[PDB]
């Protein structure tokens, strides 16, 4: 789309002339309707407009992109005259450094996104494992210390990880509560199930830093 775009990959030595300074090239972004209107008008926009220069070097859906060659002084008259007709000039000259730098910007931008994406996909996967080993280290620690706080002695505990098949968690949690619950409270015990996460209330979050609903024995629920 033309509104900021200047071409740099469709250059040619004759559709784009600037080698001294007498001749220059102005590009004109012309709506499709207006394409005939430009082919007719191009010569009249200023005096000293080079003959038959008006050709569509590039074309898109909304716009057709023209080149016209003309004298440098006359470029001011040309541009203003172009805007009355209700075209929009896009200014690009054929200085060597211009052509090269825009081309470079496309390339340098593809190379930055490319390198980065490969390191970034790799970095997350490598990060993922480390934070996994570390998450379980805290839970193991957390559970151990808690057990000491709630049961007291012995410091030697019987500890298991039980794999529950998906959607049997609530039924599993209840059965454990009935059997073992008496140990940590014979009155501090109620039936409960599943794990609900909230910021409505702080109850039901099973934690020792904010007030929660007291579980009858140490049980922590891991959702993956």
């Amino acid at each position: 789309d033309l509104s900021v775009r200047s071409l740099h990959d469709i250059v040619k030595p004759e559709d784009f002339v600037l080698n001294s300074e007498h001749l220059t090239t102005v590009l004109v972004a012309v709506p499709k309707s207006l394409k005939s209107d430009f082919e007719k008008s191009y010569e009249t926009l200023s005096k000293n407009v080079v003959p038959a220069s008006a050709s569509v070097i590039a074309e898109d859906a909304e716009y057709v992109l023209f080149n016209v060659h003309l004298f440098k002084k006359n470029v001011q008259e040309f541009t203003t005259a172009a805007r009355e007709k209700k075209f929009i000039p896009r200014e690009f000259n054929y200085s060597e450094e211009l052509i090269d730098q825009l081309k470079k910007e496309h390339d340098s931008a593809a190379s930055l996104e490319q390198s980065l994406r490969v390191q970034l996909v790799r970095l997350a996967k490598t990060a993922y494992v480390d934070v996994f080993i570390n998450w379980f280290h805290i839970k193991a620690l957390r559970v151990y210390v808690e057990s000491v706080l709630r049961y007291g002695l012995p410091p030697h505990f019987n500890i298991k990880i039980i794999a529950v098949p998906p959607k049997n968690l609530s039924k599993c949690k209840s059965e454990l509560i009935d059997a073992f619950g008496f140990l940590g409270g014979n009155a501090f015990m109620k039936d409960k199930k599943g794990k609900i996460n909230k910021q409505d209330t702080s109850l039901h979050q099973y934690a020792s830093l904010v007030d929660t609903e007291y579980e009858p024995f140490v049980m922590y629920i891991i959702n993956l």
Binding site: Y42, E43, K47, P51
Partner: peptide, 22 residues
């Protein structure tokens, strides 16, 4: 544009190129 107009502009343009240099 039409062949008569393109030769008419061709003589006019190279008249200016030289004249400016001179």
């Amino acid at each position: 544009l039409t062949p008569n107009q393109v030769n008419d502009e061709l003589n006019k343009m190279q008249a200016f190129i030289r004249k400016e240099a001179e």
